[PDB]
Amino acid sequence: MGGISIWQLLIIAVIVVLLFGPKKLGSIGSDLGASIKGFKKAMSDDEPK
Numbered sequence: 001m002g003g004i005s006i007w008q009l010l011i012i013a014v015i016v017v018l019l020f021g022p023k024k025l026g027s028i029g030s031d032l033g034a035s036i037k038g039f040k041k042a043m044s045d046d047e048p049k
Contacts, residue, residue, distance in 0.1 A: 017025065
């Protein structure tokens with residue numbers, strides 16, 4: 001009801017992408033994804049696998 005349905009997330013996700021379009025979301029994600037990149041790089045030296 002609240003949104004546990006996966007399909008509910010799919011339709012909602014689509015609207016967000018359309019309104020923000022792929023161009024804005026690319027820069028926003030990449031800009032905010034910069035911190036994630038450091039986490040991956042730092043863990044590059046180690047090898048959990």
